[PDB]
Amino acid sequence: STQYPVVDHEFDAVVVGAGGAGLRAAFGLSEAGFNTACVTKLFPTRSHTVAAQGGINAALGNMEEDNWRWHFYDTVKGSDWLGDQDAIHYMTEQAPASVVELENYGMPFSRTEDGKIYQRAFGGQSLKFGKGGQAHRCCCVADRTGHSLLHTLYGRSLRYDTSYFVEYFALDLLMENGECRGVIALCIEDGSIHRIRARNTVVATGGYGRTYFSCTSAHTSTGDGTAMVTRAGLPCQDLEFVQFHPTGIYGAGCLITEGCRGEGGILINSQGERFMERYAPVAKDLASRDVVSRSMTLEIREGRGCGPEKDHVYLQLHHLPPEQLAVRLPGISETAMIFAGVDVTKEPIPVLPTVHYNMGGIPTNYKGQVLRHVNGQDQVVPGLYACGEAACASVHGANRLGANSLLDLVVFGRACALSIAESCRPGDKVPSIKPNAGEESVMNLDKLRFANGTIRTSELRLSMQKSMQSHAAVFRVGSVLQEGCEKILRLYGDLQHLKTFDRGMVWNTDLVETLELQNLMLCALQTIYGAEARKESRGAHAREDFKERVDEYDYSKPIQGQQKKPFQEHWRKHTLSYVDVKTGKVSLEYRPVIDKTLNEADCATVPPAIRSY
Amino acid sequence: PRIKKFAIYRWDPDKTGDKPHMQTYEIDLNNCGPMVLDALIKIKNEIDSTLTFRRSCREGICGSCAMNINGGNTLACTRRIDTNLDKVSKIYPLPHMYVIKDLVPDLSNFYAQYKSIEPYLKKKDESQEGKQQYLQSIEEREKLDGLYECILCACCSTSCPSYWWNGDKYLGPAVLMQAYRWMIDSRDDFTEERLAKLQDPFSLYRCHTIMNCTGTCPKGLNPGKAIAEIKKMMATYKE
Amino acid sequence: TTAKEEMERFWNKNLGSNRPLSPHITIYRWSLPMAMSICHRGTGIALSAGVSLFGLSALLLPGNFESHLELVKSLCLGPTLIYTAKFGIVFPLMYHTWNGIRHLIWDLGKGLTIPQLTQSGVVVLILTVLSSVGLAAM
Amino acid sequence: SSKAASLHWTGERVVSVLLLGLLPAAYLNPCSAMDYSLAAALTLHGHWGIGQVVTDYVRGDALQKAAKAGLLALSAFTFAGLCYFNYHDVGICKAVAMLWKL
C-alpha cells in the first residue's frame, strides 16, 4: 500500500498462462463474446509447448481404420486405473474433433499419399482394445509439433480483442470467502502491481519440472499456479506422480522425442543387447513411458552403462533410412548435433531417464471446474477453473500416455471456455473485492525484494533440485523418501535466510527467480510427502518395499468370492495434499477415483487388470 | 583451471542517470556448460545476480536468449563459447533496440509488425471450418519447409540495417518471411490481398539485399530468399 | 488494442524516455556481403555526383569540350599519373557495374545462399580489378 | 488493390537491364542516336537510385519534400545538360573517346 502503484483492471474472465491451454481458453472465451484478460510471465510464443516434439493424439485414422474408443482404453490402461474415466472419455471423444479444429486454424501438419494428416506410432497405443496391434494415431508436424501448434494458436488469438498482459508475473489469487475474484500480478516491465479482478479465473501455468536437477522442461516451468492454489488453502492432486521420460540427452538434459521409437528407434545397452525384450516382449521398446524408463534405470543398476562414466544408455538411429530421419525427425537431428555433438545417422544418441511431465496438479473435473474436498466429497470452487499440465482432471492418472498432453491442453482449454460461456452471459456484474486484498502477496514481494540472508537464490535452488533428484528418483524406498522429507522441510525454513542482490523495480530477474523458488518449494514438499505416504507400485511411482498394486480387489483372480477393501486400505485413490504456509507442515487426505464414464452405452467402463505391456 | 573472460553490456534503469557500460566476468570453463547461456546463468547464479536476461527452453526453439555474441545475432543456448582464452567474448543486446535493462530489448514494435501481417489461415467459407480437415499434398507441404520453423527470435530483423534506419515503417525479414509463409500455403485463399498490403515503399521495398539476415539465423533458415521471392510475386500477381 | 495501436504506444513510450539504444554499426562484425553492399551505394553516390557535375558544367562553364581538354594538355601530362587518374574513374564504375549484375541476379531469385554470396562476391571483386587494369590501357 | 510501388520496382529493373545493354552498344556502335538514349537512361537510373538513398536516410516530413524536390532539380538539370552536350557539342560517345586518347 502507498509504496507500490496499485492499478485495478475490470474484466469478465482472466486466464493465467499463455501456453497451449492458456491460449485455447483465452480466445475461446473472446469467441463466445467475453471481455477476456490474459496474464503471462513470458511472451505467448516463448512458452513451453514450443518444446513439444512428439505430437498431438487424435483418433482420426488416416493410416489405418481407427475408433476413438480404442484411444480411451489405452489412456485408462496407461493411467494404471488411477485415471478418472469420465475425463478420459471427454478427451478421447473430442480427440478427432479438436485436432481437425487446429488443422483448420492453420497448423502445417505433415501429410501422406492421400493428403490427410500424418499419424505415427507412439508408446502405449494399440488397436481393437489392446488386441489388434500397434496403432498409428499421433498427429505430427515433423518433430516441431508444439512449436507450430502454439504459433497457429497464437495466430488465431489475434483475431479476437483479448487484453494480453505480456510479461506479468502472477503472485497469488484474489480470494474472498472461498470465491475467486481474479489474480494479483506484478508487471515485469516497471514493477507496478496490478489487481486484475474478474468473475472467472482460468489457471494454465504448466508444470513444476524445475523441482528436480535433471529435467527436459524449461527454466520457466516452475508450477506457479499449482503453488498459487496451494497458498489459497485449496488442495493439490496426485503431486507425487512425476513422469520420467526414457529418452533425454545425457548432456544438458534436453528431450529427443518418443517419436524416435515410433518411426523405428531402438534402445541398446553397453553389451549390445536390445534390452527391451527382457522387460517388455509384448510391445517391444514402444511400451508405456514409465515401463521403458524404469527398465533403463534398472540397466544402470547392474553396471551396464554405455559411457566412460557407465551411467547413460544409447538410442540408435544408425539403421534408419537417410531421408526418413530428415523428413520425420529434423529437429532432433540438429539438437543432438548441437548438444551431444552426435551425428544422428552415424552414431547412437546418449539418453537417460529424466523428469518430463507432472501428472498431478490442481484438482479438476471434466468440465474444467476446480474441485475442493469438503466432508470427503467433491465441491465446486466458484469462478475458478484449471486446464493443461497445471491442472489434474486426472485424464492421465498415475501415468500419462505419450502425446496426450497436447490433447489435454486443447480439449480442456476449450472446455473451460465453454463451461464459463454456458455458466453465465458476458455482462454479469463483476464481484467487487475489498480494498485490502492481496496484502499478503504485496508484502511478500516487498519482503523478498529487500531480503538480506545468509544463502542466496541460487544456493537454495540447487539444494532442492539435487535432493529431489537423489531421493525421489525412478525407484524410491521408504528409507530415502523419509530422509528426503525433513531434508526438503528444512529448506522451507531456509526461505527466511534468503539473500537478494537487486533492489530495482524494472526487470528484477533475481527477485522473480526467488518468487519462482517459493512456488517451487510448495510443489516440492507435496511431491515428497505424497510419495512417502503412498505405499504401492503404480505408474511412475514405484516403491521398492511396496512393489505390489494395492487395489480394492486382487484383480488377477476373478471377481466373485472377494471382500471389498474399505477406502482407507487401498491406494487406488487420489492423493490430495494441503500445506500450512507458516510452518510448512504437509497434511494430506484422499479422493475416490472416478470410474463411471459420461455415457456407458456410448463408451463402456474399463475394469482394473494386470498391466505388463 | 581454465578462466574465460566475458565482456557484457550493462545498463541499470534504477540507478538515476546511469550511462550504459561494459562489465567483465571471470568464469572457469571446467565446471561450466559448453554454451554461452550456461555461462550467463553461471555468473547470474554465482558472481552477480544483477544481470538481467531472457531465458526459457535452453533447447533453441523458444527464442528468448536472443542477443549479439561477438558481432552476430544468435541464440545463447545454441552458440558455444570459443575455448581460446586469449580472446574476450563480447555480449551485446540485439542491435538498435531500446534497452530496458542489461541485454533485454523492447520488442513491442517487433511483435506488432507480426500482428499487422495476420499470421492465421483465412478462408472465404469460414462457416464450414472445424469439422473437416483441409487436404494438402506432400509437395504443397514442402513449400512450407524452411519457413514455418521461424522462432521469431528477432535476430533476423535486428541484423538488418534497414530495420535500424527504418524500424518503424519497415517490417523486417522475420515478419516478411511469415507473410510469405502464409502466401504459398495452399490452404490460404487471401493470397492477393496479403500482397496488396505491401504496396508501399516502406513495408517491403526497403530491403536492398544486405543479406545480414540469412547470415545470422540460429535455425539455418533463409529469410532473404523469401523476401526476393515476395518481390517476384509482387510484380507478377494479376489484378 | 489493434495492430498499429501497439506501435503508437511503443513510440510514445520509448521516445519520451531515458532508454538508450543498443549499439548498431559500433559493435556489429564486418561481413563481406555487408561491406560490398556499402560500396555499391558509395560507388552509386560517387558516380551520380560525377554525372551531375558533368551536365551542370556543360551549362555553366564557357567554351566547348575540345578547349576544356587543351588546358589538361597544357599542364604537362603525367608519366604514369594519366593512368592513375584514368584508373580512379573505371574502378568505381566497374565495381558498381559488376556488382549491379549480381544484385540483378538476386532479383530473379538465384544465388541467394550464404556460400554463393562469398563465392560470387569474390568473383565480382576480381572482375573489378581485371576490368580496371585492362580497361584503363585501351 | 492498385499496385504503384510494385511498378516502381519493376520499372527500375527494366532501366537497369537497358543501361547494361547500352554500355557495350555505345562502345561497338558510337553515334548521335546512342547518345540520347544513354543520357536518358543514365539520368533516370541515377535519379531513382538517389531516390532510394533519400527515402532510406532522410527522416522527416519537411526534409523528405526538400530532398526530393532538390534531387529532381539536379536530375532535370543533368538530363538537360547532357542533351545540350549531345546537340551543340561532340556528344557523350565522342567525349569519352577524346578523354581516353590523351
Ligand SMILES: *Cc1cc2c(cc1C)nc1c(=O)[nH]c(=O)nc-1n2C[C@H](O)[C@H](O)[C@H](O)COP(=O)(O)OP(=O)(O)OC[C@H]1O[C@@H](n2cnc3c(N)ncnc32)[C@H](O)[C@@H]1O
Ligand atoms: C517439457 C516438455 C513437455 C512436452 C514436450 C517437450 C518438453 C521438453 N513435448 C510434448 C509433445 O511433443 N507432445 C505433447 O503432447 N506434450 C509434450 N510435452 C508436455 C506438454 O506439451 C507441456 O507440459 C506443455 O507445454 C504445457 O502447456 P501449458 O499451456 O499448460 O503450460 P506452458 O506451455 O508451460 O505455458 C506456461 C505459461 O504460463 C505463464 N506463467 C507461468 N507462471 C506465471 C506467473 N507467475 N504469472 C503469469 N504467467 C505465468 C507463462 O507466461 C507461460 O506462457
Ligand code: HEM
Ligand atoms: C550499366 C551499369 C549499371 C548497372 C548494371 C547498375 C545496376 C544497379 C542496380 C540493380 C541498383 C539497385 C541496387 C539494389 O538496391 O538492389 C543500383 C544502384 C544504384 N545505382 Fe547503378 N547501375 C549501373 C550504373 C550506374 C551509374 C552510371 C550510376 C550513376 C548515375 C548509377 C547510380 C546508382 C545509384 C545512385 C544507386 C542507389 C544505390 C542503392 O539504392 O542501393 N548506377 N545500380
Ligand SMILES: CC(C)NC(=O)c1ccccc1I
Ligand atoms: C550497412 C549500413 C551502414 N548501410 C546501409 O544503410 C545500406 C547500405 C547499402 C544498401 C542499403 C542500405 I539501408
Ligand code: SF4
Ligand atoms: S527467420 Fe531465423 S533469424 Fe529470423 S526471426 Fe526466425 S529464427 Fe530468427
Ligand code: F3S
Ligand atoms: S538483412 Fe536486410 S535489407 Fe533485406 S536482405 Fe536481409 S532484410
Ligand code: FES
Ligand atoms: S532459451 Fe529458448 S532459445 Fe535460447
